[model samples]
Target: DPNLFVALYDFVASGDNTLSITKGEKLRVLGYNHNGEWCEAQTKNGQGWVPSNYITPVNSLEKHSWYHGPVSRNAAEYLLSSGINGSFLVRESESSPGQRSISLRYEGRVYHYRINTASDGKLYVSSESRFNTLAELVHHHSTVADGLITTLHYPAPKRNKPTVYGVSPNYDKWEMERTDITMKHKLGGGQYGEVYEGVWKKYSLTVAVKTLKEDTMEVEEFLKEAAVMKEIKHPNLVQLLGVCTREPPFYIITEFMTYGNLLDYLRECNRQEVNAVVLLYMATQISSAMEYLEKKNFIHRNLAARNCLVGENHLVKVADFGLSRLMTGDTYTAHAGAKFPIKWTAPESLAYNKFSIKSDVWAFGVLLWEIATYGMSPYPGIDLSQVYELLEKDYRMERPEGCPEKVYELMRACWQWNPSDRPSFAEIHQAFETMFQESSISDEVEKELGK
Candidate 1:
């Protein structure tokens, strides 16, 4: 009976002579003893008797074994009939008398298995032969014939869709009506929301108020943004001013820049014959923002010209915290259902959904292309589906003409396919700063261009 096994540690006792354990104490147990009343258990120090009611013994038969082959039931049959040469049968527990069950272990979980035979003398393995093996096969098909399979049946795990913030459709109701601030103006609009220029108290601000079609803000999304914004403070970041939650719906208010977004500024500059000096300045600003974010243990999952705001004073502030998340340390594991914008995302990001500071650096390389081209789109000719295929073949956007040699070198460093080889944001920032310090572009030229 299941009652004979103890699942909770508190119900059992260590082999060492000790008093009753408290509710939350960590108890270490070694070796299982199935007695009627108290089960005998052992710890590093000694042994003692504990109640058997709460302790649960793992079902030894449920353990799983590993096998590599043609993977399908038909393939397994062919291999087994040909004499199970390449296949290894692992058992979860000792064969119980006359039982013919086999066991397998995968992803730290165990499952029992048994073989089936077909009518034509073909030996067939269990129907549930493939689980974690599909992903492994898809990733390594080129190296082994056994890895090639007809199709994989894995489903994209169900996830709660992301809630987009800081946008609005009801322009008249939420729009500013001729404020005292003279710099206010409409900037741009997209399917999601519109951008606006305005003042926040005394500071020159360009705020993008996101108004949703309907109220779809989830509690987790709201809290995730709040958690990261509360702890991070940096000059290059568009400061989160406040949030309005009391109303029927909600919107996020952020500090705005006078010069609008990077793309707009770059477009204006290109029309006016801006030189390479301005490119250097833009790179420096972006690198500074990346460096600051890295220092704070954060990853800016999306980095592009549209996501950067350029102030009238030429300060570049990285905007759009919608895709940003905090990293615990140098190494960060990807959460199961994180979403990333496809266009600017790195190759590894699309493949594994795993992102790190290095992935952000890859996006920075694309941003460098955007900045140099004065707002041209990345991979302009290719459609979304073809992006992965092209990237897998080592196809990457090239640095546009007039981009400085040092800046191009930096971009190459950041765009390396291997994440570990990519330069850190700090390193990129220092390189740009050094270039600026040693720049031949005079103050007079910079003043002329409003650098």
Candidate 2:
């Protein structure tokens, strides 16, 4: 099997087969089964035939090598001597006998390499190894080590905290008082916080209350989010109802959309009688929000389908201010650093960590692609690091089939490598509005023939 690689299993048939192979060990595929299915292989062990479903071929094992050892002075020295260098230094190491192995850092990629080591000292690594070269790895480790020592390092990004605070032990008691408003439902939760669906006053509202997690930083991110939300208002943007800060867990309540997010709505609409009118309306809503944000000198740093909330009336509400930043005369400081979402970020945002209305427009271009493709993820199968490399090479997410050519052109304009080259949100809004007005145009003809 050309695609198959040899992997040594601790238990050919019995025993706990965990941590049986060291990560990043190159495997050689010896032969394939008679049916051209599974491959017989050798991996620092007696040859054996294993199912082809297991192994994948990779070039380097630097990531896995970094994983097996602690990110101490010893590990750093080893990596440097071994010809690996990068900005991220190993702050610490975590490994178990078999399960998950990860590294902790103040910045850069949060979850690093997960190494699986055999009792015999052999190693096997995941595809994530494609991220680094020997030189890059060493450099990253050294830079990260310096950053950690010089500054009080913050942990990687996490989910937003829920927006429920200071609700007395009688919190449930109040639920009884507003039985009509109180309903049992679940909202999605992440490293940030939990989400729940509940009633507000007489309206049956789906609300996402984000609470902040404890961090080393002096300023609370949740408070920053709350302050931004309180200051910004637009019809296309999600409304922040209130904030609760007088407690251990602070929360912010915002209006929720029954239709979930823009991605969900688009996926559901797949193969359905897609109303171009409705799609145009949704695009307009987003542009309106962008216009408002530009006016307020705020850039929705992270604009994607997932951040958009869709209401019962099919209106799009821009959500998630975790990455948003206020601009001071066309320049915005991105506190989150270069590690932000690579897929949606413009090249300028990645390089300088400075965002502008134009940068947001680039993200909007990606947003347009998502809408056109019924909420497909940008760079579907590519890793974040790979995506960056591809962007550097001028490769970008292309509009899928049936996308409006005018809009697709606009998206490409937004994705321009230079922020100065990207169109303004006002321009994007005007272009999308034009596409909406000319709704009778044939999407296929326009896309292929550029009519």
Candidate 3:
């Protein structure tokens, strides 16, 4: 199980132990220990041992979802071949704490397993299992589907289907109501074309509209971009609203953020002496968004403060997808001699025009430097042509003024020569989260911290 947790009581800490939880608080129950007196759990406030009795027993997975959840990642063909089903695996549905739905396959036919909660809050396999789910049903043959059980088979997994995310959208509802966008003002220019603030008549809302400017853009590429635009939708991302491809000069409409680009916004804030805490928040938001993209196997070919739009309350939404692409597997190759943001491009990318999550990671390090320096140009005075040469020779930028040492350390980690050596967006995001969280606790190290 994964993410299964419950808060059973407000009992005071009676022993010399860590992880204190007050009344009406929740705890992430990991598992039980000897004699059932202690429960290994994790709490947002802390982590470690806790009295099992003090913790609440989840009456229903309906209300709690974590458990016997698989923490292991097994994507290798050999590991996958070993076992298919009737076996325990953990997954995150990004749903409520109690619900789990995994589509399985056997004998080349697809099967879906749903763990639903009974009135008593007990989890059981739907339609059959009398006992609780998995705990008793583990040995049973219900894991079989179409009566061809090898304890084996999964459709996508069996066929080596890429682990790409994002569901296909219902485009019928997305078509605009007859060219609803009316250009209000030009916002900025990007690799694709010009962006304009427009009035969306159908919803009476302001939106950013982009018109493709690439002379080489084909009808297939245009549709592909729009299709992907519809596939991805999130708060921290510049969301696509509708497409105006019914006519020439196809327009892609997205939500309009009140504040403009992050680069410009940071400069303005720096003039007014905005606290560095705010910068940390912005970085965290961007990292979280990037982590989301990484999980979906989306490559943000262009990730920079200039490409990020600031909305109300300092909300940052990543914008511009002209160069973005979804990978079928792990990496993507750019056609020979493709133009790119040379300064932000990674070592391998600059040399071979290869792109991956790690290449994007390198750009993020540069982005961090930009955010820390109030939008200062990366590698001041260094020509774009020299960037690759210097990077090849292991040359790196000095620490920015007013930036924290730890932050700089993180930037160095991102600049690692080997793509695999660099940290994942998930790790980088966690680093930011941990720094912010530790700062909130205000330990001694915080006083020694700089901007």
The number of clashing residue pairs in each candidate reads 26, 39, 16
Cα lDDT of model 2 by residue, 240-348, tens digit: 7666665644666677667877887788874434444356567777987888887777777778888888875455778756645566247776576347877788777
lDDT of 1 by residue, 328-390 (tens): 245455676876777788878888887888989999988888887888877887898898888
Question: 146 in model 1: Cα distance from truth in Å?
Answer: 80
Higher-ranked by lDDT: 1 or 2 = 2
Q: lDDT of each prediction vs. the true structure?
A: 0.53, 0.55, 0.63
Task: Arrange candidates by lDDT, descending.
Answer: 3, 2, 1
lDDT of 2 at 418: 80
Top candidate when judged by lDDT against the true structure: 3
Candidate 2 lDDT for residue 59: 35
Off by over 4 Å in 2: 1-184, 189-192, 201-206, 212-219, 323-325, 335-338, 380-384, 436-451
lDDT of 3 by residue, 1-451 (tens): 4555565444333233435676446678766654455666777777665666455545542222223232112112112223344332323333244455343333322233555667866655545544455444333433453222333223222221111111112224465644556887788654435778898764466888877656746767777878878777555887787787777677777778888899989888744334454576678778878888888878887888998889865668787475466662377889997988887889988888889988989999999999888899889899877888898899999877666667888999999999999999989977875553223212222444532
Order of quality (TM-score): 3, 2, 1
TM-score against truth, every candidate:
0.51, 0.54, 0.59
